Each structure stands twice: as structure tokens, then as C-alpha cells.
Design a protein around this ligand. Structure first.
Ligand code: PRP
Ligand code: PRP
Ligand code: MG
Ligand code: MG
Lengths: 344, 347
């Protein structure tokens, strides 16, 4: 017997929800039955009552149960995501994704256009000439032909639009900011997942563990929702349904310390210029961070196998990410991705 | 540069607002400039952070600054309110309403404030209508009622038309929020004294702080059974507000010879049932309902007495109980309700 008064009442009492309550709430939102006030109340209360992995998993599962799927047998078993919660990072994630795909690891990303001038995943890709708004059959064909696909959230999650509007109206991060990485409709089993919210990274890791994903959930100790080069990073390594928390230092692999002012994401047009520069062989702090993050995604991919060893997996990941840039394979993959969109 | 992201961000970080921020928010809400999502976010966030008296006082201040006032010099300086937050989840008779009539009949001017029920079968305003009292009079006529009858009723929707945006969000989300505190703090006649019920034990102290800041003489009451009234089934917690300060007491009616009642004996019904119960009490029916009415009327009289620095607690209660009982026993309360009904029918 579920209801808003009951569910919101329980959250304002600072109590974890009973099993299925988060799911009921998200289903109401997804079926268009929740008024904007109810959506907003739920998002704030869930946020101020620290969400648990069970609750966030319930929200993401309901969202996925409403999403358009990709066609049967079109997503490889070892596809990876590279994505962060933001709250930015999109330049790094996007470049790293292209590098990973160029290395031979299939990548399927998922995202929105940004509400600000600060680019979303989608905005930077469009600036580079990639057609981001394609239907399931064409994303599958992209993945097969180019090695990478992008699922536009507005297209694959049409029932989420009311929630999206509420989030923009309240304008501050909530539990819904966690769901991007957890609601990729291609359902990749691996990924490098950035989380800006240090206290919630462990929660996201828990959700991925329940799904038997091989993921590195990463939080830069300088706040970045990516593996940073300015200092150490905290990694929640997810494999075989378990989570190990680690401190990671890229200097151990010979990466120079950089400054934060050098790495943050900006608008889509500037992100686009930075992509072209890095993929064209420009050296410096941005390249290093892209390489490190690409390697991280390759390591997560390697973890799909029970016989993967941490330090050797990192060394291979770094070699592969560097080579994908240095040979021009990453630059050529982007060009082939642009051409894909222009040829139907 | 105040904004919703700023204010909501601060509340969701579990931080108290800066001075002026709650006021800014409430003012956006009252002028129709707040989206429903923003209203609901604000109400919920503030509730979970734990509102301060400064914050709640700002909200109520903004409401009062937008309300229709009564004409100048028409509200006596010692007028009292008898009103509560509601939301106690018990279907009780309209104890504040019955106590208000008794208090007015004892000679203390009363200006009540209210709406038609949120989640009981019958609110104070619904029960008054069923008795034949006109609830929806304007400022001039409320002031005239106060002068001619000794009591007036300010219909919350009539006096706070701009609250409609907040009210609708409250109804949509259902859960109690800080907004549930505002009714008793926003009587448009601005009485300086009152017996104020609070269903939410954790927020009563906050309400008491708001009244202390305005230099009101108020008893903020929470029955330890959960009632937003002085109860007869058990003890009540009272936050006594006098001289700009608050002190917390526990009140036991056994100390004044009241027998313990059971909660189901104070149960009410629809507006006709509760109207019938008002008629029975004013007519001299003895029993648990009368006891609770007499106790609550006495509490409002004690609050009124506290407008003087000289008032002492136990003498005040004894006087209040004598006055409340006499007002019923002499027929003064029954006659005042009749005179109130007649006043309204004569336009
Ligand atoms: O606010 P939203 O539209 O929901 O998007 C949140 C994040 O998702 C995208 O990141 P990306 O996928 O590039 O990962 P990254 O942030 O780790 O670069 C976008 O650039 C934001 O950083
Ligand atoms: O939920 P709302 O519509 O905001 O109203 C809250 C309370 O206001 C009235 O109480 P009051 O103490 O004035 O009257 P009663 O005790 O006589 O019922 C009403 O009867 C509710 O109890
Ligand atoms: Mg009451
Ligand atoms: Mg009550």
C-alpha cells in the first residue's frame, strides 16, 4: 500500500525506505503520474536522507525497465562505458572514450545536452560533428562499424523528461545526479565511472557490484569525477560482486603532477578544440589525464576476466592508450565516427 | 544575489540560511514567482535540515507583510488566539474552537484564524459553518464582530490570498513540513497572546521561539499523547513564552482534579457531528469533552494573564479554570455563540 505521504514521511523521518518503495516512487515519476512537487520533494528528501545502494539501484532499475533497449545481440559482452556524474569532466571522459574505442575496446556512452554553457557529453560530440541523436538500430550499427556508440538520454529515456525539468528548476545536485552512469540503456558490463560526490562513490560502487559489473568507480582526491593527475585518487574496484577501496597514485607510472586549472572541462566549443589538439598529438597535462583515464577503462574491461592482475593490467592499459593516440588511430576513429553520421 | 540554487544548496548541505534568505524565498512563493518544484524543494529541505526560529519567523513575517490587515485600532491590545497546527492524525472534536467561544464568553477578546480541514473529517472553520457562523467575512466585518460579539474569525484563504501557491504544493506532497507551522504564527489580526497547539513535538520549541521574538504571551502545547491541544488523557508539554523567553514545562491535569480520559472519548466526526458536540458542551453536558474544553479555555486565559508581568502560574490556572467553567455554567458561552450566529445573519 504505497503513497507519497508514506514514502516522503519516511524519508523526512531520516529512515531508509522499505524494499520496493524507491522503485514505486521512480515508477510513478516514469509513468507520468507524479506531479512536479512530488518529484521535487522525493529528490530532495532522498538526497538529504543519504541514499543507500539498494535505493539507488531501485531507481536505476525502474528507469532501465522503461528505457528503449538496443536490438538483441548488438552490444558486445565486453562493451565499456566511460562517464562521470559531473557536478566539469566531459572533456576528459569524451576523449578517453574515443581513445579506448580506438584501442579496440567497444564503447557505448550515454548522456544529455547540458543545461549550462558548460558542455554535457552530447554537446562536445555535436561540436565535433558527431550525430548524437540516433535510434537503437543506428547506435548498434555505429558500435559494430565505428567501434563506439552514443545513446542520447532524451531519446532512450523519453519518460524521464518530467524529472529532467524538475532537476533544472531546483538547480542543485540530488540523488538523480547519480543515475547517469547507472542507466546506460546498452547496459555495458564494464566501465570507468567518475563520481564527484566522495560520500556517494561507495554507494554507486555497491549498485555496480549487485549487477556483477567490472567497474572502477573513481574520485580524484582533489574533487574531480575522473582519475586526476594533480594528486592521488580513490578507486572503488568492483569485480565479482565485491568492492575493494584503494588509493591510487599516477606518479607510480611516471605521470607528472599537474594543476587543477589545467584539467577541468569548459564549454562544448572549447572542449571540441581540446579534443582535436589531444587527438592530434598535443602533449601536456590534458593528454596525460586522458591517457590515464583511458587506461583505467581498459583495466576495468580486463577485469571482466577472473585472471586479471592490477599492475600488469595498468601497464597494458597505458601502452594501449598511448599507442591509440600516437598512431593516429584515435584521431581516425573520430573522423570515421563523423563520416558514419553523414552516410545515413 | 539570492537564488533558488543558492538557498536550496545551502539547505541540502544541512546549513542554516543566512539572514534574509528564508524571507526572500517566502516572498518569491507569495508573489507567484516560485515554480511548484522550487516551493516543494524549499519546504522539504528546510524541514529535514531542522528549521530555526529565525528562519520560521522570517517565513511568517513575509506572510504577514502580504496579508490583509484589520482596520487600525480595531483589535484590542490583549486579544488572544486559540489555534493549532493540526496534523495530529486523531479525529478529535474541535477543541480550540469550543475553547475560543468559552474564552470570549469569559470576557477575553478572541480573534481566531483558520481553513476548511486538511486531513480531519471537520476543521474549526467547517464546524463553525455547520453551527451557522459566517466564516468568510472581510476585515471591516471581522473587526465589527470582535467589537459587537467579542469574537471574530479570520478565514485564512480570505486574508492570505497569496498563500494559494504554497497551499497547493502542501496538498500535493502530503507530508508535514515547516509550512504546517505557519497557520498559528500568521493570524492577520496579530494578537499578542495565545494558546498554540503543535502536533510536532520536535518543532514546538521553534514555534515558541518565534513568539518569544515578537514578545507574545503564549503557551505552545503538545499533548504527550500527540494532540495539538492540552490533553486530558495524559500530561502535556508546554513551552511557556513570557518576557521574550521560553521555558519548558510538563503540565498534569490531575493536579487540578481532572480525571484521565481515553482518546476515543475525544473523537469527533463530520461537521454536523462536531457541531452537535459544541452544542452539547455549551449546553452543559458533562464528561470528557467538557473537561478538555475547560482545560484549553483556561490555558488561553493563562496566556492572556501573562500579558502582565505580575501574573503567577498557579493562581492564573485556578482563575482560568474558574472563569472557563463559569462561562459555560452561566450560559454565557451558549448565548455568545447564538449572538455570533445572529450577528452574521444580520449582515
Ligand atoms: O549533468 P548531466 O547532463 O546529467 O551530465 C553529468 C555529466 O555527464 C557528462 O559527463 P561525461 O559522460 O563526459 O563523463 P565525465 O564527466 O567523467 O567526463 C557531462 O559532461 C557531465 O560531466
Ligand atoms: O490543516 P490546516 O487546514 O492548516 O489547519 C490546521 C488546524 O487548524 C484548525 O485547528 P484549530 O486549532 O484552529 O481548530 P480545532 O482545534 O477547533 O479543530 C483545524 O481544525 C486544524 O486542526
Ligand atoms: Mg486545535
Ligand atoms: Mg486539534
Amino acid at each position: 500500500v504505497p503513497s507519497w505521504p508514506q514514502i516522503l514521511g519516511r524519508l523526512t523521518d531520516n529512515r531508509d525506505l522499505a524494499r520496493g518503495q524507491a522503485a514505486w516512487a521512480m515508477d510513478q515519476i516514469m509513468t507520468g503520474n507524479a506531479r512536479p512537487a512530488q518529484i521535487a520533494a522525493f529528490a530532495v528528501a532522498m538526497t538529504m536522507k543519504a541514499p543507500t545502494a539498494d535505493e539507488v539501484g531501485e531507481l536505476a532499475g525502474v528507469m532501465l525497465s522503461h528505457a528503449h533497449p538496443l536490438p538483441a545481440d548488438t552490444v558486445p559482452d565486453d562493451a565499456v562505458d566511460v562517464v562521470g556524474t559531473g557536478g566539469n569532466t566531459v572533456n576528459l571522459s569524451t576523449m578517453a572514450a574515443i581513445v579506448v574505442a580506438a584501442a579496440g575496446v567497444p564503447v557505448v556512452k550515454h548522456g544529455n545536452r547540458a543545461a549550462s554553457s558548460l558542455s554535457g557529453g552530447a554537446d562536445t560530440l555535436e561540436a565535433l560533428g558527431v550525430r548524437i541523436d540516433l535510434g537503437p538500430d543506428l547506435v548498434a550499427r555505429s558500435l559494430a562499424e565505428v567501434g563506439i556508440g552514443f545513446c542520447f538520454a532524451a531519446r532512450f529515456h523519453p519518460s524521464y523528461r518530467h524529472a529532467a525539468a524538475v532537476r533544472r528548476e531546483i538547480g542543485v545536485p540530488t540523488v538523480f545526479n547519480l543515475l547517469g552512469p547507472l542507466t546506460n540503456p546498452a547496459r555495458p558490463r564494464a566501465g570507468l565511472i567518475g563520481c564527484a560526490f566522495a560520500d556517494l562513490a561507495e554507494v554507486m560502487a555497491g549498485v555496480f557490484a549487485a549487477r556483477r559489473s567490472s567497474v572502477l568507480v573513481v574520485h580524484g582526491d582533489d574533487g574531480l569525477d575522473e582519475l586526476t593527475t594533480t594528486t592521488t585518487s580513490t578507486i572503488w574496484r568492483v569485480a565479482a560482486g565485491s568492492v575493494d577501496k584503494l588509493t591510487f597514485d599516477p606518479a607510480g607510472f611516471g605521470f607528472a603532477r599537474a594543476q587543477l586549472d589545467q584539467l577541468a572541462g569548459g564549454d562544448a566549443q572549447a572542449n571540441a578544440a581540446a579534443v582535436r589538439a589531444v587527438l592530434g598529438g598535443a602533449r601536456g597535462p590534458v593528454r596525460d589525464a586522458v591517457v590515464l583515464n583511458a587506461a583505467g577503462a581498459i583495466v576495468a574491461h580486463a577485469g571482466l576476466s577472473s585472471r586479471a592482475e592490477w599492475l600488469p593490467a595498468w601497464e597494458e592499459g597505458l601502452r594501449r592508450a598511448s599507442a591509440a593516440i600516437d598512431t593516429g588511430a584515435a584521431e581516425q576513429l573520430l573522423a570515421r565516427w563523423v563520416r558514419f553520421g553523414r552516410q545515413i
